[PDB]
């Protein structure tokens, strides 16, 4: 077992998030520095997020070791993720939510039912806190519990493109992102993010309280912004290149506006409707936690 650092597991260098920028390693924040926005006539107002359902998927026993980290990251950032809403994994996550479970969350992000001492794992109280919310990813597809797939993206845009004044105001002009870019920059970035050990991020997001959680939110705001960026490219209506002075600038219109696009395209990853449900639910939970 790994004891959680007072700053959270993300303080550990083992869980550091990084993205190649035209193939060289870089912190997400300094990729976000390359981003630039051209505002348009439309506006994003942020409606309040409906509070997530109290209900959890039944903590049913399942054979095998669920690979929950890869499931979430693939559902959010992977190329053509499949079976994103298959219930079993999440039932196991709910089993992690239980007060005295034998289940463990390995730092691999695999969920083990047995207490396998050879494999290091996150502190059970912390994963209980994390699963207690995130198992609700399990009812992403049930009609009773589907998250808004449209309005939530306002928040995404606000947390990505939004200037501190706009984030205070809660409204921003709908924006067209752009950055000097290499071939396949959005796919490569998405690959760089899908490899992230995000369970440390979410576990810290749930278990941490007071000053520690706030310092975590400031230290990690750019990470969350990179995740939001990958999602936004997945849902942006249109993505193109612009040749300028022998440099291609990638352009994504528009940030904060979910187009509900489902057909795959070269430029970016793509959400099938099931992926859309999943991401919407994930955003509901994650923003509900981030804004508190």
């Amino acid at each position: 077992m790994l004891q959680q650092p007072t700053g959270g597991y993300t303080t550990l260098e083992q869980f550091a998030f990084t993205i190649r920028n035209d193939g060289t390693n870089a912190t997400p924040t300094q990729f976000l520095q390359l981003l630039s926005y051209e505002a348009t006539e439309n506006e994003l107002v942020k409606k309040t997020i409906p509070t997530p359902e109290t209900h959890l998927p039944s903590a049913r026993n399942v054979p095998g070791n669920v690979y929950i980290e890869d499931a979430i990251t693939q559902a959010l950032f992977g190329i053509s993720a499949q079976n994103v809403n298959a219930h079993g994994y999440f039932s196991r996550l709910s089993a992690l939510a239980l007060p005295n479970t034998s289940a463990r969350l390995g730092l691999d992000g695999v969920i083990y039912n047995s207490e396998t001492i050879n494999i290091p794992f996150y502190d059970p109280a912390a994963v209980a806190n994390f699963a207690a919310t995130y198992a609700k990813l399990g009812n992403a597809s049930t009609p009773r519990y589907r998250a808004d797939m449209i309005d939530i993206y306002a928040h995404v845009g606000l947390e990505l493109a939004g200037t501190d004044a706009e984030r205070a105001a809660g409204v921003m002009p709908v924006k067209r992102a752009k950055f000097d870019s290499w071939e396949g920059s959005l796919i490569s970035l998405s690959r760089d993010v899908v490899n992230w050990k995000i369970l440390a991020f979410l576990i810290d997001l749930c278990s941490l309280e007071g000053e520690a959680l706030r310092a975590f939110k400031t230290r990690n705001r750019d990470v969350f912004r990179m995740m939001l960026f990958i999602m936004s490219t997945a849902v942006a209506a249109n993505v193109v290149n612009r040749k300028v002075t022998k440099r291609v600038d990638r352009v994504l219109e528009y940030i904060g506006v979910n187009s509900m696009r489902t057909a795959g395209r070269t430029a970016t990853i793509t959400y099938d409707l099931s992926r859309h449900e999943f991401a919407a639910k994930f955003l509901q939970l994650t923003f509900t936690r981030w804004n508190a």
Binding site: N61, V62, P63, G64, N65, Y67, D70, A71, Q74, G78, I79, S80, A81, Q82, N83, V84, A86, G88, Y89, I117, N118, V194, A263, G264
Partner: protein
């Protein structure tokens, strides 16, 4: 094999049903140009308990080329442990920690 609802509701007690269950994880994606399904495939029968108790591995294919398909199952480490004979000749797994 098929089981109408009537037969599930009226089969003699103590007879052994033989249900079948799809593992549809190895269904490939549809073409972008396949016609939309206006209808809805439905299902009635489900297990109350895990059914894949005998299952060592699942979905031996690549998602992409490098990603694992969701629900893919690696063989348990124990299937490969081939440790030792005990001091008296019983089979033993390898020691976990060195001590």
């Amino acid at each position: 094999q098929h089981v109408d609802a009537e037969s599930i509701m009226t089969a003699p007690k103590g007879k052994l049903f033989h249900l079948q269950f799809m593992d549809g994880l190895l269904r490939p994606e549809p073409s972008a140009f396949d016609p939309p399904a206006s209808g809805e495939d439905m299902r009635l029968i489900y297990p109350l308990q895990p059914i894949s108790v005998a299952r060592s591995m699942r979905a031996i294919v690549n998602h992409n080329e490098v990603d694992r398909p969701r629900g893919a199952v690696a063989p348990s480490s124990y299937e490969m442990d081939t440790g030792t004979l005990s001091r008296n000749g019983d089979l033993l797994y390898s020691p976990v920690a060195n001590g």
